[PDB]
Write a protein that binds this ligand. Structure first.
Ligand SMILES: COc1cc(CNC(=O)c2ccc(F)c(CNC3=NCCN3)c2)cc(OC)c1
Length: 304
């Protein structure tokens, strides 16, 4: 019915706002990225600081794991992405081509491609092994807020401050569908559901929506949080109860029942906007991270 997430660890070390937290697919790590130009690796279960990964010349707005938990990709204001070997901490490739800040990134499930979105209004598709840019999509007419592959890798969903949500054919780069075709409000985050049938989208009017991709129709709307300014990550929680999880500009983590749309819990503790949340792949564990008045990551655990 409702979860009982409670604060277990607070992870300190970043010196500017945290921008993104992500659990490794094998469950043992949390990665965090920050405006302080650093990636940090933490033990997922005990919050134990593991290492700092450094090399970007300006702040990092997103980081993402490969399917095998061995690689990270980061998106930076230095206009590049970097692919990192987590074990060594070494930068394997620097992905050059965007002409403005890189804001968002993800691997495909095969982990042979990286997709990126930028303030230059484009979506780029990159070959992981060579670091070459395979395609540049003129996807949007304002900064790109999120990019995500579906479960079989054949689709990319993108969102932008231009108000659009578009779905792209990975193989050809051509647009399959414009899911949201408004010019306002900004679409500040999007992500496929784990089975690839639905799309979770945030708009900067304090709204999250669950869309049916195939039918192009809105199935659920989630409200009650504060989101009018920042591109805040949102998540499907699937290890226990089926929830939607999101940060909020009132410094709380919100948890909703996916089916009934009722708020089931609000997690209090951060002292700034909760910009990023992540859900552990096998345990009922949430990671949350906050902006510059706070700069910490918090690990929360639930019995269900
Ligand atoms: C007025 O125009 C704007 C204002 C903005 C406002 N900036 C942010 O919300 C922001 C800044 C730094 C971050 F690290 C993060 C968190 N990172 C992240 N979220 C989803 C993928 N990665 C968010 C954005 C924008 O385009 C994107 C255009």
């Amino acid at each position: 019915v409702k979860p009982n997430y409670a604060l277990k660890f607070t992870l300190a070390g970043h010196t500017k706002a945290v921008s993104s937290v992500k659990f490794s697919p094998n469950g043992e790590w949390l990665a965090s990225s920050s405006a302080d130009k650093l990636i940090k690796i933490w033990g997922a279960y005990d919050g134990k600081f593991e290492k700092t990964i450094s090399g970007h010349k300006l702040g990092i707005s997103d980081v993402a794991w490969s399917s095998d938990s061995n690689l990270l990709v980061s998106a930076s204001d230095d206009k590049t992405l970097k692919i990192w070997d987590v074990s060594s901490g070494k930068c394997l490739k620097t992905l050059k081509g965007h002409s403005n800040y890189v804001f968002c990134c993800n691997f495909n499930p095969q982990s042979n491609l990286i997709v990126s979105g930028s303030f230059d209004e484009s979506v780029r598709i990159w070959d992981v092994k060579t670091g070459k840019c395979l395609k540049t999509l003129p996807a949007h007419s304002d900064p790109v807020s999120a990019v995500h592959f579906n479960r079989d890798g054949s689709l990319i969903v993108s969102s932008s401050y231009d108000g659009l949500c578009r779905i792209w054919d990975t193989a050809s780069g051509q647009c399959l569908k414009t899911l949201i075709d408004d010019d306002n409000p900004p679409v500040s985050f999007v992500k496929f559901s784990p089975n690839g049938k639905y799309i979770l989208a945030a708009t900067l009017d304090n709204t999250l929506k669950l869309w049916d991709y195939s039918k192009g129709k809105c199935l659920k709307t989630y409200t009650g949080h504060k989101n009018e300014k920042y591109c805040i990550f949102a998540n499907f929680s699937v290890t226990g109860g089926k929830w939607i999880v999101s940060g909020s500009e009132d410094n709380l983590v919100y948890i909703w029942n996916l089916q009934t749309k009722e708020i089931v819990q609000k997690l209090q503790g951060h002292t700034d906007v909760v910009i990023s949340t992540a859900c552990h792949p096998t345990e009922n564990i949430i990671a949350s991270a906050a902006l510059e008045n706070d700069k910490t990551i918090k690990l929360w655990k639930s019995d269900c």
